[PDB]
Amino acid sequence: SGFRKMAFPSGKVEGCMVQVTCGTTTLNGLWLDDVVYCPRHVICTSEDMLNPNYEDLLIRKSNHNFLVQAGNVQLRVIGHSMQNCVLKLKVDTANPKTPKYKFVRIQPGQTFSVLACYNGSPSGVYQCAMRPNFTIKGSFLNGSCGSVGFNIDYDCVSFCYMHHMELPTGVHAGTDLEGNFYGPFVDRQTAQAAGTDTTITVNVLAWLYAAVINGDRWFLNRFTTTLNDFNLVAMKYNYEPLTQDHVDILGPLSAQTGIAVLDMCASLKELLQNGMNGRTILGSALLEDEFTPFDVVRQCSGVT
Amino acid sequence: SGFRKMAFPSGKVEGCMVQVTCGTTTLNGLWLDDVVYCPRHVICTSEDMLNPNYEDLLIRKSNHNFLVQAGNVQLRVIGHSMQNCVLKLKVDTANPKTPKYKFVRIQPGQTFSVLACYNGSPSGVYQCAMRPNFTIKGSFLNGSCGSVGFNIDYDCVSFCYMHHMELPTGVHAGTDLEGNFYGPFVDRQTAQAAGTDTTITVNVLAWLYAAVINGDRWFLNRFTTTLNDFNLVAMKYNYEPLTQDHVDILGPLSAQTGIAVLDMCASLKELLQNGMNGRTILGSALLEDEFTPFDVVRQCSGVT
Numbered sequence: 001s002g003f004r005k006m007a008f009p010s011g012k013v014e015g016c017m018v019q020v021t022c023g024t025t026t027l028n029g030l031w032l033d034d035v036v037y038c039p040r041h042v043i044c045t046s047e048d049m050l051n052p053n054y055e056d057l058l059i060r061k062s063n064h065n066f067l068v069q070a071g072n073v074q075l076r077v078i079g080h081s082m083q084n085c086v087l088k089l090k091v092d093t094a095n096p097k098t099p100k101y102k103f104v105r106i107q108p109g110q111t112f113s114v115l116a117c118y119n120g121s122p123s124g125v126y127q128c129a130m131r132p133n134f135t136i137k138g139s140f141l142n143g144s145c146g147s148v149g150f151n152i153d154y155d156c157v158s159f160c161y162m163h164h165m166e167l168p169t170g171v172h173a174g175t176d177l178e179g180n181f182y183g184p185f186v187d188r189q190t191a192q193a194a195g196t197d198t199t200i201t202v203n204v205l206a207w208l209y210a211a212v213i214n215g216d217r218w219f220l221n222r223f224t225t226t227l228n229d230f231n232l233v234a235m236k237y238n239y240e241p242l243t244q245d246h247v248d249i250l251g252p253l254s255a256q257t258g259i260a261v262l263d264m265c266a267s268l269k270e271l272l273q274n275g276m277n278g279r280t281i282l283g284s285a286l287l288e289d290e291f292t293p294f295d296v297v298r299q300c301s302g303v304t
Numbered sequence: 305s306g307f308r309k310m311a312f313p314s315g316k317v318e319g320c321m322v323q324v325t326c327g328t329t330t331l332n333g334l335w336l337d338d339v340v341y342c343p344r345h346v347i348c349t350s351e352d353m354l355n356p357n358y359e360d361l362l363i364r365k366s367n368h369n370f371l372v373q374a375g376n377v378q379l380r381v382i383g384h385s386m387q388n389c390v391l392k393l394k395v396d397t398a399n400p401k402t403p404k405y406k407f408v409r410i411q412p413g414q415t416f417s418v419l420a421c422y423n424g425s426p427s428g429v430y431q432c433a434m435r436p437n438f439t440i441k442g443s444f445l446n447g448s449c450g451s452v453g454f455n456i457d458y459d460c461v462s463f464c465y466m467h468h469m470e471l472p473t474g475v476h477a478g479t480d481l482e483g484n485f486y487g488p489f490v491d492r493q494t495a496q497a498a499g500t501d502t503t504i505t506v507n508v509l510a511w512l513y514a515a516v517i518n519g520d521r522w523f524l525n526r527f528t529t530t531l532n533d534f535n536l537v538a539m540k541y542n543y544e545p546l547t548q549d550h551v552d553i554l555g556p557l558s559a560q561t562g563i564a565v566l567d568m569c570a571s572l573k574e575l576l577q578n579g580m581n582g583r584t585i586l587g588s589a590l591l592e593d594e595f596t597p598f599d600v601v602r603q604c605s606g607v608t
């Protein structure tokens with residue numbers, strides 16, 4: 001037992017990390033097959049970021065201007081092209097360490113692991129969630145752009161995120177592997193404020209089920225509620241409204257613990273209205289929302 | 305910016321994970337060079353764990369009785385021996401994926417990454433701290449024994465932990481890579497209660513410095529304190545007493561932020577005596593103690 005914010009093993013992603021340099025700017029790239037994926041702002045100078053015309057800037061660039069280094073070995077660039085906000089650099093060698101992979105665009109409320117990188121070298125790994133307002137709350141310093149988010153299904157890596165920027169608010173924004181930003185964010189150094197970030201209700205409930213499984217039961221009560229009644233409370237406390245689909249994904253956890261989804265909603269309702277009263281749940285003093293129902297099942301069963 | 309419970313990239317450790325089977329019991333092993341390291345209770349049947357005589361049990365075992373599988377390939381066992389609570393199985397092949405490594409015995413209050421494994425396959429990675437009472441608060445299900453804790457210094461993996469057991473309290477105990485348990489724990493299914501777990505004071509202060517660096521400054525106050533005055537408060541709240549050595553390791557963070565170590569102690573004192581008043585620090589509603597001063601510097605500078 002025990003419950004931790006657990007990341008996927010980062011090994012398959014580490015072997016794909018490269019360093020991409022264009023002029024004075026250096027950031028991370030993702031090498032899969034004979035292609036290196038990186039944020040298009042690698043062609044920008046800090047000055048350009050106020051309002052870059054990426055098409056005009058990329059015209060001044062040739063294959064030899066993109067230096068791609070994998071550890072200590074230089075990759076030869078035979079092609080370059082821009083797809084939305086990412087650059088695709090075709091190299092002459094397929095990555096021998098390319099794992100089975102997919103490029104997927106995750107839904108808000110879903111979770112993923114981030115392998116933070118600097119100069120193409122990995123520094124650490126952590127679990128993240130795509131917030132409902134399409135930002136992530138990561139840990140990224142200068143040179144971390146190009147670091148990727150992923151999920152792993154046995155041997156297949158599903159890449160879902162590429163880090164592009166930190167907003168003036170300290171929150172993070174980026175793209176899927178097709179170069180499309182999550183949310184309304186643009187790859188420009190401008191005033192960009194994230195919308196109201198709601199709490200992911202289905203993840204809080206799934207984490208409450210995880211607490212019941214692992215011993216923490218103080219928050220359970222003699223009450224029940226309905227989807228409409230719970231949602232009045234969820235709206236007051238800036239929680240996502242719960243749907244029948246959310247109820248259904250909670251099915252496995254409801255069945256294992258024997259606590260009805262609406263009964264757990266009544267426990268959540270009382271915690272929202274009364275707080276924790278100085279108590280903790282799974283070592284946290286607040287309601288955790290970065291564990292999906294799938295994450296809880298996986299951790300409580302030991303899927304490798 | 306941003307601050308996360310970040311684990312080391314687990315790649316170098318993934319390539320060392322194997323599956324060790326002895327009779328009906330299967331757990332994880334660590335393959336470095338021509339040796340496989342695993343918990344000695346792999347020779348036990350669930351019945352034996354009440355009071356196992358490991359020397360007597362190991363006499364009934366031969367090299368052919370230890371089945372060691374690395375993914376899909378079987379390793380040939382040419383030697384076996386027990387060193388404290390770990391078994392060392394000499395195999396006929398050096399692990400081609402062995403990284404540069406050390407075996408180190410960490411101090412209480414230090415942190416490490418755990419690569420949780422089942423049947424020799426990695427499921428996830430998380431950051432842990434060796435508690436002052438020598439237990440860890442992990443996430444381990446049946447079949448996770450043999451999973452290891454480590455730290456990484458550029459290319460050298462320092463293994464510090466091997467998981468051996470969950471106490472009836474749900475907390476975890478294990479050994480260093482020489483088979484010596486951290487704390488008073490024995491590899492036996494008996495009543496074993498961890499001592500009083502104190503909060504790691506130097507890590508809370510280092511995490512407070514991390515909050516100041518990353519924007520959260522509400523907790524800073526117009527007060528200061530002394531080592532003796534602070535320690536009266538730390539003793540009341542079951543915090544480790546602060547020493548001049550703790551003050552000195554906080555030197556880099558004190559210098560970067562310009563906030564004197566004793567001034568930050570006065571902020572910590574007020575948080576202990578008054579709580580958070582419903583506020584948060586780095587997304588946490590309690591005082592985090594699983595980030596060492598070294599972890600904070602590393603994350604705030606981007607060491608790969």
Ligand SMILES: *CCC(=O)N1CCN(Cc2ccc(F)cc2)CC1
Binds near residue numbers: 143145146166
């Ligand atoms: C790779 C993008 C990223 O996360 N960082 C690089 C730039 N950093 C500074 C920054 C912060 C906020 C801004 F509005 C612009 C630049 C932060 C880390």
Ligand SMILES: *CCC(=O)N1CCN(Cc2ccc(F)cc2)CC1
Binds near residue numbers: 445446450467469471
């Ligand atoms: C590898 C040891 C471990 O963490 N586990 C295996 C046994 N599990 C059950 C257990 C719990 C508490 C006990 F006192 C004995 C056995 C938990 C996970």
